[PDB]
């Protein structure tokens with residue numbers, strides 16, 4: 370069926386939207402090529418609508434069915450609990466879109482009974498009605514990029530009351546099921562370093578490794594009613610409370626499978642018959658579905674000694690090469706199978722034979738050296754989008770601080786250390802806002818993070834090694850340098866200079882700020898300090914960080 374049917378009503382903004390990089394007094398110290406940076410707005414949503422609107426046909430064979438049977442067997446071993454209203458409420462982000470029923474995320478979080486009452490009525494409705502399509506709002510995402518212009522992505526989501534209901538019914542399922550079903554293939558269980566460890570060991574476990582990433586064209590849109598019912602049947606394999614089963618059946622029939630689309634002005638924009646990107650099960654359903662299709666496609670393609678790594682629609686496969694010609698033919702067959710399953714490629718997959726050249730989750734493994742001179746593998750990515758976004762965040766307060774996420778997730782990298790840490794620590798110093806906790810996202814989930822904890826956070830996620838990496842790869846350095854020329858970011862030598870200042874300014878504050886100065890900026894100075902373990906690092910609640918992915922899932926930790 371058509372992934373979408375549109376009425377003609379526009380996708381409308383709430384607030385007026387800025388597409389142009391806001392410039393303040395700090396902007397130029399990060400970036401000079403301001404016109405390279407933009408934010409998507411609803412005003413390009415029509416282009417997106419066109420892209421995402423197509424017919425899906427699906428042809429399911431025995432490999433598909435075998436894998437599903439296997440997945441269901443693993444899923445039958447999971448037991449999940451219903452969350453209480455209160456618990457579901459506490460997982461709601463403070464910025465989460467307000468209900469149309471006259472209450473907002475903050476009413477939910479501090480548990481006003483106006484919200485709780487409504488949520489209870491939503492839940493009772495979900496139990497009583499398993500057929501009535503649930504209304505959804507379609508919005509254009511405002512996200513920041515560097516010009517290559519992408520149209521806005523679309524966010525489709527049910528009312529706040531329904532979302533708390535999704536959490537009650539499904540939060541535990543989407544938190545536990547994926548790792549049980551997909552085992553080590555489930556990408557969201559990995560910190561970046563564990564992700565590197567997995568990729569590195571898997572690569573090394575092959576006599577002749579070949580790897581490829583598979584780009585599905587608009588994954589959400591290729592997701593069919595059948596896919597969404599299949600994933601429900603996987604959920605229902607779990608040991609669930611009877612109300613959980615009912616709510617899941619009902620959210621599936623009424624929401625997940627499809628539904629009417631309403632813009633922010635209240636007009637009907639049409640109808641959706643594919644994955645909604647603003648629901649709890651977006652990440653988990655995509656992951657399962659991507660895994661299901663891809664594992665079946667690996668069998669179709671007779672890929673040998675095949676290891677998958679899946680995060681939502683992001684798939685990377687490492688397997689035994691059969692030589693470039695056979696590999697290419699394998700990927701064609703893999704692609705035809707995926708296509709038959711309604712997951713056709715954007716860019717057709719290409720075999721790669723160097724781990725460091727495989728991009729997956731927009732990242733690649735790279736190598737630098739620790740203090741010992743010993744080679745170390747770590748995760749990096751092209752810094753262009755991070756820096757674009759840092760530039761936006763340099764002038765604008767934003768609900769999510771990508772800079773802070775990037776420093777955390779990419780702490781060991783050259784660009785996060787020399788540029789992100791230097792710039793933003795500089796800004797925090799100047800505003801004496803070092804102590805203020807900032808919201809950032811990790812695997813789609815919102816965390817409140819205190820910048821002063823970065824050293825302990827990075828020691829925990831990455832090891833002290835991340836504060837000592839040097840002698841980065843030529844291809845990594847060239848990518849960064851090239852990125853800096855594109856965006857007009859000052860060279861790494863300026864950043865080193867600045868960092869020496871930022872470091873001393875931090876050391877002078879003493880305490881946590883001084884620890885930030887000490888660890889975060891040890892690289893900056895000729896004559897270095899001894900980076901020993903940080904006692905407080907071992908006191909950090911890093912439980913929940915890399916358990917599952919929660920994008921579009923309206924999740925706050």
Ligand SMILES: CC(C)CCn1nc(-c2cccs2)c(O)c(C2=Nc3ccc(O[C@H](C)C(N)=O)cc3S(=O)(=O)N2)c1=O
Pocket residue numbers: 559560561562564588646651652653655656680681682683730731732748771773774775778779810811812813814918919920
């Ligand atoms: C280990 C890590 C470095 C790999 C790169 N990386 N980085 C992040 C970051 C979060 C915050 C700063 S960087 C991050 O949150 C993600 C990340 N990966 C996704 C992949 C595919 C995804 O697909 C969704 C399910 C869909 N198609 O609907 C979603 C994500 S994510 O959970 O938003 N976040 C990620 O992959």
